[PDB]
Structure 1
């Protein structure tokens, strides 16, 4: 039965059937998660650029990389940013369904450098749940911060 889990580790080392990239705009290698994805699955960046609020899947071999471009809250208002963040996750759920995969590795979109200097764990996680609750896939959320793992883990347990 479909679950949610959280792991504090590099998503480029995930054990799931596909990976969501916290993609930088313009198809660029970016920083953080995006850069790790670029180093592990560079061929997935061929023609990967996609607008803020959307997702685009490129295969690396037969492994799907879902490039999801969340808004950068240094450039978006809070209301417009929230709408595009919600929409990016929606498009992730649509791609996961289309691919038919049994599991997916996801990072929290629009946190870190695309956060507008704000803690957006809860905002981004709740959009993740809303979108992925609509799918059948096992979801494994990948973070790096130890306090975030705790908070994510608590949220996962509050809905079981």
Structure 2
């Protein structure tokens, strides 16, 4: 575990993380995909061997000794708000199980279902709160990755609101 387990946020490409493992915002079929998933495919293509897994689940595949945790959030274009919310919470609980099993001291994680799976809605608070519910009981250093300056500010404020 980390000496003093913490949450941090960085505004940069998750493919350049400084953590002991990465969470992919994967699609269920293990395709190269878009956004975070395409950046992960470019950096760790070997990790896409038999990475297909259902919505609400996480499947880890090693690239060398570096673990890629493929976490499949729901596409809110297809799911109801209610069922989508349940599957999004479930995907993060499966990420916490994998991070724990791997014994890593740190993990790089994107906000699941906030990109092309958001159904055109702002889901920062919804996704981040489900991340906290899952990861609060783990002792890895969690580093959340985002793209946009306004998202970095709101994620940072939410982290500080608890400390």
Question: TM over 0.5: same fold?
Answer: yes
CA offsets 1:48-85 (integer angstroms, 9 cap, x no match)? 00000000000000000000000000000000000000
Select between 20-29 and 81-90 the one with higher mean Cα deviation.
20-29
SS at match of 2:162: coil
Deviations 1:16-53 (A, max 9, x none): 00000000121111000000000000000000000000
User: Separation in 2 of the partners of 1:159 and 1:22?
Assistant: 25
TM superposition shift of 1:2: 0.4
- Structure 1 unaligned residues grouped into runs of 5+: none
* TM norm structure 1: 0.99
Distance 1:106 1:52 in 2: 17
Q: Distance in 1 between matches of 2:18 and 2:60?
A: 18
1:15 is aligned to 18
Q: 1:4-153 maps to which residues of 2 (within 5 A)?
A: 4-153=7-156
Q: Distance in 1 between matches of 2:62 and 2:53?
A: 15
Looking at structure 2, the residues matched to 55 and 107 of structure 1 have their Cα atoms a distance apart, in angstroms, of 14
TM-score (norm 2): 0.98
Where structure 2 has 5 or more consecutive residues not aligned to the other structure, the ranges are: none
Structure 1 counterpart SS, 2:56: coil
Equivalent pairs, count: 160
